[PDB]
Amino acid sequence: PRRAPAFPLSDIKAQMLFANNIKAQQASKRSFKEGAIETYEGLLSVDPRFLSFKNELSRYLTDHFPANVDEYGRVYGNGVRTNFFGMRHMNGFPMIPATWPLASNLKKRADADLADGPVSERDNLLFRAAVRLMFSDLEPVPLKIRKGSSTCIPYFSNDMGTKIEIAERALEKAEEAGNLMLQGKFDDAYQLHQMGGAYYVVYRAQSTDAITLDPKTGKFVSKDRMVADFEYAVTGGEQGSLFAASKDASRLKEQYGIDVPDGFFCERRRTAMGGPFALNAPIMAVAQPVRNKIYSKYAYTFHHTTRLNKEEKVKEWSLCVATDVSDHDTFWPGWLRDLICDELLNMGYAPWWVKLFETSLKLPVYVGAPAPEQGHTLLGDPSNPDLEVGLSSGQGATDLMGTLLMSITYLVMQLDHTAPHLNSRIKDMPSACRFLDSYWQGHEEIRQISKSDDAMLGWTKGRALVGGHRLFEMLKEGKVNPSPYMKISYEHGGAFLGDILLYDSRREPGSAIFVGNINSMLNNQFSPEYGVQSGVRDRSKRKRPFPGLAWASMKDTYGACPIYSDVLEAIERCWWNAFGESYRAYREDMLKRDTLELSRYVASMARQAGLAELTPIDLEVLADPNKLQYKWTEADVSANIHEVLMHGVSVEKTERFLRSVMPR
Numbered sequence: 001p002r003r004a005p006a007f008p009l010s011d012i013k014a015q016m017l018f019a020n021n022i023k024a025q026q027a028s029k030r031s032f033k034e035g036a037i038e039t040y041e042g043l044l045s046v047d048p049r050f051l052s053f054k055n056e057l058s059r060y061l062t063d064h065f066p067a068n069v070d071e072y073g074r075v076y077g078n079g080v081r082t083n084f085f086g087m088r089h090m091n092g093f094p095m096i097p098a099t100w101p102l103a104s105n106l107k108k109r110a111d112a113d114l115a116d117g118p119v120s121e122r123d124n125l126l127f128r129a130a131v132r133l134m135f136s137d138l139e140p141v142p143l144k145i146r147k148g149s150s151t152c153i154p155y156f157s158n159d160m161g162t163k164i165e166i167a168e169r170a171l172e173k174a175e176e177a178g179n180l181m182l183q184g185k186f187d188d189a190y191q192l193h194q195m196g197g198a199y200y201v202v203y204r205a206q207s208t209d210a211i212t213l214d215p216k217t218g219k220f221v222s223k224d225r226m227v228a229d230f231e232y233a234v235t236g237g238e239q240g241s242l243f244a245a246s247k248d249a250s251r252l253k254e255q256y257g258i259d260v261p262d263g264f265f266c267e268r269r270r271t272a273m274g275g276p277f278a279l280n281a282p283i284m285a286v287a288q289p290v291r292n293k294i295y296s297k298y299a300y301t302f303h304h305t306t307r308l309n310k311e312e313k314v315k316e317w318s319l320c321v322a323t324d325v326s327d328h329d330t331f332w333p334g335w336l337r338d339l340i341c342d343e344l345l346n347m348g349y350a351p352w353w354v355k356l357f358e359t360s361l362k363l364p365v366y367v368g369a370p371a372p373e374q375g376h377t378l379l380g381d382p383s384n385p386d387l388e389v390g391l392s393s394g395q396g397a398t399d400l401m402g403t404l405l406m407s408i409t410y411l412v413m414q415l416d417h418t419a420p421h422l423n424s425r426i427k428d429m430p431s432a433c434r435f436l437d438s439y440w441q442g443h444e445e446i447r448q449i450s451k452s453d454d455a456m457l458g459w460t461k462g463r464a465l466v467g468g469h470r471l472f473e474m475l476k477e478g479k480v481n482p483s484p485y486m487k488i489s490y491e492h493g494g495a496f497l498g499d500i501l502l503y504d505s506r507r508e509p510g511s512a513i514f515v516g517n518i519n520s521m522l523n524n525q526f527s528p529e530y531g532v533q534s535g536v537r538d539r540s541k542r543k544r545p546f547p548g549l550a551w552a553s554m555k556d557t558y559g560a561c562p563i564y565s566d567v568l569e570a571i572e573r574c575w576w577n578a579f580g581e582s583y584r585a586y587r588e589d590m591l592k593r594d595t596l597e598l599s600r601y602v603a604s605m606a607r608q609a610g611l612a613e614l615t616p617i618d619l620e621v622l623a624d625p626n627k628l629q630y631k632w633t634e635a636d637v638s639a640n641i642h643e644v645l646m647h648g649v650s651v652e653k654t655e656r657f658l659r660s661v662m663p664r
C-alpha cells in the first residue's frame with residue numbers, strides 16, 4: 001500500500017539537493033556526531049563536579065518538594081508537578097538510535113481511529129472559517145530573518161547578506177515557480193528557483209526527559225522513547241519495527257573515557273526539519289502578516305505574554321481545563337493542508353502561491369544521521385512531492401498550521417461535549433465566521449487560550465458549564481477520546497506556556513494564580529539544549545547569545561513559584577558542596593560580562609548602559625532565543641533587542657509581493 005521511494009546520497013536526486021559548495025557538501029555527508037556540551041564557558045556538561053552537583057540537587061529537591069498535583073491534574077501548594085530527576089542526563093550525548101521520520105502518517109492516524117477529513121458539515125465550516133479569519137485583511141510587513149539561521153537546501157548559507165539576496169529573489173520569482181508546479185514541472189521550479197527539493201532532517205536534543213527512582217531497587221529508570229527503523233518509516237508502519245531507543249550512558253566510559261555516575265542517561269533526541277529557504281521566503285511573507293492579525297484581533301485566544309496577562313483571562317472562568325495532545329506534528333492531517341489550500345483558493349488567493357504553500361507541506365525529507373553508520377537517504381521523490389509526514393517543523397507557517405488545527409479541534413470538542421445549543425449559530429459560512437470571530441475574541445460562554453498543542457479551555461456561567469464538568473470527568477477517566485481529530489487528554493499538572501496554574505483549597509480558576517515553573521528554571525540553567533558556542537564570535541548568531549542575562553530576569557520569571565527561595569538556596573548549598581564556590585557570585589560575574597558584551601550589539605546602548613531599558617522577556621530571549629519560537633513572539637520584544645536577533649527585507653519589496661498574492 002505504497003512504500004515511499006528512497007534514494008541514497010549517491011543518487012542524482014539526493015545529489016541535486018546540495019549545492020557545489022563546501023557547507024552544502026558537508027551537510028549532505030555529515031556523520032553521526034556526539035560529545036559533551038560547554039554548559040557554560042569553561043564548564044563541560046560531563047564535568048565530575050557538575051554531575052555530582054546534579055546528583056545532590058535532583059535528590060534533595062525531589063525529597064523535600066514532592067509533587068502537589070490533585071486527582072484532576074491541578075497543581076496546588078508547592079507548585080511542583082514531578083521529581084527533579086529530569087536533569088540527570090549526559091548533555092550532548094544522544095539516545096541511540098534516533099527515529100527515522102514517517103514518510104506517511106495515514107495508517108498511523110487511521111489505526112489511532114482519527115478522522116480522514118472533517119466529520120460534520122459544521123466542522124468543515126469551522127475549519128474553513130479559521131482560514132477565512134486568519135488569512136483575510138492582511139497588512140504587509142518586512143520579511144524578518146533570524147540571524148545565523150541556515151538556508152538549507154540547496155546552499156546551506158548562514159550569511160545574512162546571502163539570505164536577503166535569496167529572499168528578495170524568491171519573492172520576485174515565486175509566481176513563475178508556483179506556475180511551473182501547477183504544470184507539474186517540479187524539477188524545473190527547483191532547478192530554476194530552488195523551490196522544492198526536500199526538508200533537511202537534523203536531530204535536536206530534548207535535554208531533560210522523564211526519569212524515576214525505583215524504591216525497591218534504588219535504581220533510576222529513564223522513560224523509554226519509541227523509534228521507527230528505516231523499514232517502518234518508508235512503509236508508514238506497514239512493515240519494519242517501532243522499538244525503545246537506548247538511553248544507557250555506560251557506553252561513554254568505554255568509548256570516550258567519561259566517568260558515568262549511576263542514574264545518568266543519554267538525552268532524548270527529537271527530529272527537526274529545515275526547509276528550503278527559497279520556498280519558505282514567499283510562505284513567510286504571508287505567514288508573518290497572519291501572526292500579526294491573530295495576535296491583535298484575536299489576542300484573547302492567541303496573544304500570550306506574562307503570567308498575569310494569562311491570569312486575567314483565566315480568573316474570569318468558572319472552569320479551566322488544561323489539555324494535552326499526543327505527538328501533535330507527526331499526527332497533523334494532510335486533509336487539513338488540502339482543505340486550507342481549497343479555502344484560500346475560494347478566498348481569491350493567487351493559485352500559484354497556494355501551490356507553493358501546498359507543496360511545502362508534501363515535500364520529501366533528507367535523513368541525516370540518526371545513529372552511527374545510518375542515514376544519508378532521501379525519502380520521497382522531489383520530482384513529484386507526495387509525502388504525508390504530518391507537519392514539518394521548518395515549514396514557513398508551522399505554528400499557524402498547528403494553531404489552526406488545534407484551536408478548531410478544542411472548539412469542536414467544547415461544542416460536542418458541552419455546548420449543543422451553540423450548534424444552531426453555525427449554519428453556513430457567514431454564520432460560522434461570525435461565531436468563530438466572537439469565540440476567538442473570548443465573547444462566548446465557551447473560551448480558550450492556545451498556542452499550537454498547548455491550551456487551556458474555559459467555561460463561564462451558563463448552559464455549557466455542566467457539560468464542561470462532564471468533559472473534564474471524561475478526560476480524568478481516560479477511556480474515551482473526546483476528539484475525532486487528535487488523541488486528547490488532560491495535562492498532569494496543568495500549565496500554559498511554561499506557567500503553572502497554581503490553585504488553592506477552592507480548586508477554582510478565580511482563586512488560582514499563574515506562577516513560573518521552577519523546574520523550567522532548572523532545565524534552562526543546568527540542562528541547556530546547546531553549548532555556549534564560545535567559538536562563534538558574533539553572539540547574535542549563537543543558539544544562546546547572552547546566557548548570563550537570564551540571572552537578571554530570574555526573579556521576575558520564577559519569583560512567584562512557592563519554592564523559589566528554597567530552590568535558589570538549595571542550588572547555592574549544592575554548588576558550594578561540588579565546586580567550593582558561590583553559584584550566585586558565579587552568575588553575577590556572567591551577568592556583568594554579558595551585560596557589557598550586549599552593549600556591543602545594541603546601538604542605543606552606551607559602552608556600559610546597563611539593562612535599564614530591558615524587560616524580563618528581552619532578557620530571557622537574549623539568553624535563549626528558542627523561547628521566541630515557542631513561548632513568545634517578535635512583538636513581545638523591545639525594538640532595539642529585535643534588531644540583535646533578526647534582520648528584515650524592506651516592506652517595499654514585501655508590499656509589492658503581497659499585492660500579487662492576496663485577493664483584490
Ligand SMILES: Nc1ncnc2c1ncn2[C@@H]1O[C@H](COP(=O)(O)OP(=O)(O)OP(=O)(O)O)[C@@H](O)[C@H]1O
Binds near residue numbers: 454495499523524630
Ligand atoms: N528550552 C525549553 N525548556 C522547557 N520546555 C521547552 C523548551 N523549548 C521547547 N519546549 C517545549 O516543551 C515541549 C515538551 O512538551 P509540552 O508542549 O507539555 O512542554 P513543557 O514541559 O510545558 O515546556 P516548559 O518546560 O517551557 O513548560 C516541546 O514540544 C517544546 O516546544
Ligand SMILES: [Mg+2]
Binds near residue numbers: 454
Ligand atoms: Mg506548558
